[PDB]
Amino acid sequence: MNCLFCKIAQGEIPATVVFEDKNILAFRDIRPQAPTHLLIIPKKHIATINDVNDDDSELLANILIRAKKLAQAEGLSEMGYRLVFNVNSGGGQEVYHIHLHLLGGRQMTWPPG
Amino acid sequence: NCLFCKIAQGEIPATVVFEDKNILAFRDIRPQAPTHLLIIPKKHIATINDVNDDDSELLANILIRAKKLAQAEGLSEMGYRLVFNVNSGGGQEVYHIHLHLLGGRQMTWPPG
Numbered sequence: 235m236n237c238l239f240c241k242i243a244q245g246e247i248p249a250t251v252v253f254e255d256k257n258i259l260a261f262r263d264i265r266p267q268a269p270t271h272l273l274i275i276p277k278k279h280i281a282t283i284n285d286v287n288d289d290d291s292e293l294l295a296n297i298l299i300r301a302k303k304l305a306q307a308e309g310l311s312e313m314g315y316r317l318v319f320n321v322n323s324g325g326g327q328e329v330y331h332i333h334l335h336l337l338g339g340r341q342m343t344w345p346p347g
Numbered sequence: 348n349c350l351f352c353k354i355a356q357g358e359i360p361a362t363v364v365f366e367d368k369n370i371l372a373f374r375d376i377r378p379q380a381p382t383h384l385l386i387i388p389k390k391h392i393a394t395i396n397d398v399n400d401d402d403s404e405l406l407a408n409i410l411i412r413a414k415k416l417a418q419a420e421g422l423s424e425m426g427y428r429l430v431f432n433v434n435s436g437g438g439q440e441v442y443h444i445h446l447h448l449l450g451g452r453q454m455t456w457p458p459g
């Protein structure tokens with residue numbers, strides 16, 4: 235209830251949508267941590283990676299595949315980019331709807347937080 | 348000439364934590380967190396930029412295996428972070444795809 239990303243996926247909160255298909259939505263993170271910072275989400279509400287079982291694992295892989303296609307469309311792939319899933323508070327997750335971060339447009343450094 | 352192919356096939360030793368016909372997971376020798384695992388396909392794919400839709404089964408296997416390794420390591424609730432570096436600007440140095448699993452401390456923002 236009151237999931238921010240479900241609200242975005244339902245058109246109830248403004249966002250810059252860069253990709254949509256029947257299952258997946260991608261949009262800009264409002265607090266970008268790199269010159270381009272995108273989020274790729276399932277439209278289905280799944281709280282954390284720990285809640286992805288075998289029946290949602292193809293969807294999760296397809297989020298990753300869409301992120302790599304989107305990185306090309308957005309001009310990030312030639313220089314390079316980083317993909318991040320955060321899981322729970324110790325992993326940095328704040329919104330409890332799974333999201334893949336796509337960060338690029340500068341050199342990404344090590345460690346990754 | 349691929350370091351991770353050699354590890355996958357047993358030609359170079361590693362601290363292996365999981366192996367099946369498709370995947371190998373091992374401890375990073377320069378760990379950036381108390382838990383720092385690398386999960387690789389045995390199949391050689393050079394970079395995430397080369398992924399195709401026929402990789403969905405293997406990529407799902409890698410991601411689910413990461414979830415399961417996080418559980419066995421004690422990180423499911425404490426929290427953890429999964430990272431792919433893609434090409435030089437993403438921090439990739441070895442051109443065989445590898446998923447980083449990091450946890451056992453607070454992971455911070457930005458993620459590098």
Ligand SMILES: [Cl-]
Nearest residue numbers: 253303304307
């Ligand atoms: Cl796209």
Ligand SMILES: [Cl-]
Nearest residue numbers: 366367368369
């Ligand atoms: Cl085996």
Ligand SMILES: [Cl-]
Nearest residue numbers: 369404405408
């Ligand atoms: Cl597989």
Ligand SMILES: [Cl-]
Nearest residue numbers: 365415416419
């Ligand atoms: Cl395991």
Ligand SMILES: [Zn+2]
Nearest residue numbers: 237240279331
């Ligand atoms: Zn949601």
Ligand SMILES: [Zn+2]
Nearest residue numbers: 349352391443
């Ligand atoms: Zn290889």
